[PDB]
Amino acid sequence: STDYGILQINSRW
Amino acid sequence: IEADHVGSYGITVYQSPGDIGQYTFEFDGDELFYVDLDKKETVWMLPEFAQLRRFEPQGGLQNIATGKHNLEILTKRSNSTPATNEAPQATVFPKSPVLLGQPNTLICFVDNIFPPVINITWLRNSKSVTDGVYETSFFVNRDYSFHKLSYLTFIPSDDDIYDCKVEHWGLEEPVLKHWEPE
């Protein structure tokens, strides 16, 4: 099985 | 926040200058793996686990790239407030009960690390050790500082005494934590 990482969101410039 | 278990899937830390980044997975406080940003591989602490589960390193790289991105944006937002250097505190203790002649492992637990840049080395009879040394990644702490552990394989004897040398920006001089068997 495959592990999934919690996504980090990119802030707006 | 209480619970039976806790998984941190994707702790992402980035630091500047130097372009220093770290991406790890922790389960119940232990290190599942870290992604080698340079070699671009998932490095599992317990190699057997890599046989039953897998993580695509790209996810690691990607999250780091974003960490970098949010660092600039946040540095600007604070009007370039630098990180305060903390004084790391080390503790040395044996893995197993000390027995003359029985192979063992000395553990150097360093807490309150910040920022996440440090050198943890071993001295045997005041001389630097190279072989038999291994180290973990930085683990997160509730206060957002980190902890790290270094390992030295050794055999307890009458003549050998040891030191865990910690060198950090928050320390005026490298600190030595002494340890000798009984």
Place this chain on the structure above:
Amino acid sequence: GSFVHQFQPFCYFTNGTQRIRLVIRYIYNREEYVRFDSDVGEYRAVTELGRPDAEYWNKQYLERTRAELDTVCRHNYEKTETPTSLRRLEQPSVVISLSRTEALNHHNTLVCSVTDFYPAKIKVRWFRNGQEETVGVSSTQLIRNGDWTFQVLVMLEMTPRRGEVYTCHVEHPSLTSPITVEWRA
């Protein structure tokens, strides 16, 4: 000097996947600026630095984040932690040693070293001639070696007399039957 950014996700599980809570912290150096807490349901600004983020993320990433409670937390627990972390069983080694050099009828301390075990749940008891010791037992905290094993030291304040049998009694999930070690004066 330098500047640090930390992104720390947390999947809190209770009774397996019966209750999963997802907390995501965004931190600058050591200040948490914006946090997503599934108990709350949306992103929130912890400090002023987080407003530019909370506002926007609740519009474009709210549902995607909430769904991670299933796509990441639950998925990992059931498909990857299950056959590894949750299946790991390491038996404790138990050995007794005396603190001070022996001399009958003189106070001393027995040290029961319970080491190299996983998971953390463990019970360590001291017995003196078949009776369980309580008040004179002291213990260290559970020590995390950092290599997926723990260790703990349980001491017993005692006075070695002839004929006495001191027993360190350890119960752990990796063991069908308790491990006991005796020490006789």
